[PDB]
Amino acid sequence: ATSQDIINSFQSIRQEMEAYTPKLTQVLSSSAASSTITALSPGGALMQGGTQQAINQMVPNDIQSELKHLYVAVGELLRHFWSCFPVNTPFLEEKVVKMKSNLERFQVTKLCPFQEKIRRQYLSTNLVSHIEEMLQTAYNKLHTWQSRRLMKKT
Amino acid sequence: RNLQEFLGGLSPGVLDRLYGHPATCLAVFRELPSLAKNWVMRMLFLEQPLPQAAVALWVKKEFSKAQEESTGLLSGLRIWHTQLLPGGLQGLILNPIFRQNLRIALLGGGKAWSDDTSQLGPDKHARDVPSLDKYAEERWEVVLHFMVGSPSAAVSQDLAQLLSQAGLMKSTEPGEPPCITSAGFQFLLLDTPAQLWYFMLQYLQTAQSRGMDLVEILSFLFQLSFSTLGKDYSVEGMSDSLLNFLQHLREFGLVFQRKRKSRRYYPTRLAINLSSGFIVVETNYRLYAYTESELQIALIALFSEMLYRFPNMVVAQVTRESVQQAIASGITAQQIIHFLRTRAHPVMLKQTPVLPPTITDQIRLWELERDRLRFTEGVLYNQFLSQVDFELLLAHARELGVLVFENSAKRLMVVTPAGHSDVKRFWKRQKHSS
């Protein structure tokens, strides 16, 4: 890793543990035990009890049906995009651009009103986040492939 | 009875004083259930009481029964106590003395349980582990023979008085040896560690009669339980009464000591197990025992018919007549099954269960033969002219709690002989009021 400072640290710890004596009080303290119990108590950091408390009844099923429809549409569009990939012919180059344009139009048409409705109802779930992740990944992949295509022509 | 049953019946002061010894705390802890031990370990380093609901939320809903049982056991043993948490809540915190002593016994601190062993140097007359085990077995066999009454066993008069107080043997006529009762036979059939524990419990229940400190005796016994086999300890540092108690231990074989004035004592394997195979059973009702001492031979012959006695082997047959005779002697079938399971040869341990089910079922069925007929002395009433009159008398008898059997269909009832007088007076009084 680093320079001979690693060997210096090894020698230092060897000397430190050369004279080793067991301890009792220093091992645990009442404050440390209380903090550990609070962390391990229900509702704590490691025992997070929320985890979308009533997501089955949160974000009403009217929105849930629309969310499922958006998921299906995005899945179909991405399936078409990945079927087009990889682009081995110049014909597919325009098809991927058309698919990207369709994805952007669908996003603007549906997800933006979807995001507005979610913000109006102030739903705590980040339902849009996963959809954005897939769309962002597809856009990044297309941009990377276009960059490669430009580099191949250099 | 187990240790927890005896401890739960003690006063809070006795329990508090018992926790003052590190050895006692470990013995109490190892008797706790598995769920209780985790709670004790978690609360080991807590200086603040915890809410009852918070502790209750650690266990799942389905296992709430075990949680309640463990909490009740801990409350009875007074390991922890409820604290009035500010705001109307109830806080649970372990006993500070018990917690400190347990931490000392685990982490370390204070002085050792024994005073010292290197002050006197090596033992001039030290023995070996097999020799100690042989001495303990000989002492136990002598005790059990004295229970039978053979002249080969000679023990102190105090031991005979203790046995008489234990109810195993009663001295109807002074001077003559006591006669062993049915409870004596049941105790004799019991397992050796179980017999030791029962004897110690009987000693403790009557410990106050000799003016001996129960707490000190219990602490010393627990310290002996955790003692390392084959290593001696210093007699010095103990009260005289405890020393006298130690002498009784020397009589029982739990502790080996060459002389009464000696400062060394060697705990035995029996003393270690106080805090808590050679018999092969065949499907044809045959027992093959790899034993030589007359004690095991007599114990097996108590409930079976002996057939052959090879110098290192005993071949016996378990028959209906022998089991019936043993039951008539007062020994139950469950005791026989437990004895066979405890003495089971290591080869049979592969079988699941160790004893074949057919033999145990046959023994249990043979036990049920004796109690086929049920006998209840009483007085029969059959002269009820009216159902309403019968109902009132039956209700009065049930209120008196002397009813044995009732038949409202035929207006027939039976009362105990003692309660017959009250029923007769009540029936006569009702007619007088009519």
From Swiss-Prot, chain A:
Oligomeric state and interaction partners are given as:
Component of the 7-subunit TFIIH core complex composed of XPB/ERCC3, XPD/ERCC2, GTF2H1, GTF2H2, GTF2H3, GTF2H4 and GTF2H5, which is active in NER. The core complex associates with the 3-subunit CDK-activating kinase (CAK) module composed of CCNH/cyclin H, CDK7 and MNAT1 to form the 10-subunit holoenzyme (holo-TFIIH) active in transcription. Interacts with PUF60. (Microbial infection) Interacts with Rift valley fever virus NSs (via OmegaXaV motif); the interaction leads to TFIIH complex proteasomal degradation.
- Chain coiled-coil ranges: none
Q: Which residues cross the membrane?
A: none
Q: What modifications does the entry list under PTM / processing?
A: (Microbial infection) Upon Rift valley fever virus infection, interacts with NSs leading to ubiquitination by the NSs-FBXO3 E3 ligase and proteasome-dependent degradation.
For this protein's source organism, the top of the classification is: Eukaryota, Metazoa, Chordata, Craniata, Vertebrata
Shown part of the complete sequence? 395 to 548 of 548
Q: What is this protein called?
A: General transcription factor IIH subunit 1
Q: Where in the cell is it found?
A: Nucleus
Family of the protein in this entry: Belongs to the TFB1 family.
From Swiss-Prot, chain B:
Give any Gene Ontology cellular component.
Answer: core TFIIH complex portion of holo TFIIH complex
Its ancestry begins with: Eukaryota, Metazoa, Chordata, Craniata, Vertebrata
Question: Highest taxon of the source?
Answer: Eukaryota
Q: Which family does it belong to?
A: Belongs to the TFB2 family.
Task: Provide the alphabetized UniProt keywords.
Answer: DNA damage, DNA repair, Nucleus, Transcription, Transcription regulation
**Subunit annotation:** Component of the 7-subunit TFIIH core complex composed of XPB/ERCC3, XPD/ERCC2, GTF2H1, GTF2H2, GTF2H3, GTF2H4 and GTF2H5, which is active in NER. The core complex associates with the 3-subunit CDK-activating kinase (CAK) module composed of CCNH/cyclin H, CDK7 and MNAT1 to form the 10-subunit holoenzyme (holo-TFIIH) active in transcription.
What's said on domains? The C-terminus (residues 305-462) stimulates the ATPase activity of XPB/ERCC3.
Localization of this protein: Nucleus
Principal cellular location given in the protein's record: nucleus
MF-aspect GO terms: ATPase activator activity; double-stranded DNA binding; RNA polymerase II general transcription initiation factor activity
Matches recorded under InterPro entries = Tfb2_C (IPR040662), TFIIH_p52/Tfb2 (IPR004598)
| One Pfam family per UniProt | Tfb2
UniProt function note:
Component of the general transcription and DNA repair factor IIH (TFIIH) core complex, which is involved in general and transcription-coupled nucleotide excision repair (NER) of damaged DNA and, when complexed to CAK, in RNA transcription by RNA polymerase II. In NER, TFIIH acts by opening DNA around the lesion to allow the excision of the damaged oligonucleotide and its replacement by a new DNA fragment. In transcription, TFIIH has an essential role in transcription initiation. Stimulates the ATPase activity of TFIIH subunit XPB/ERCC3.
Record carries keyword Chloroplast: no
Its protein name is General transcription factor IIH subunit 4
BP term (GO), one: nucleotide-excision repair
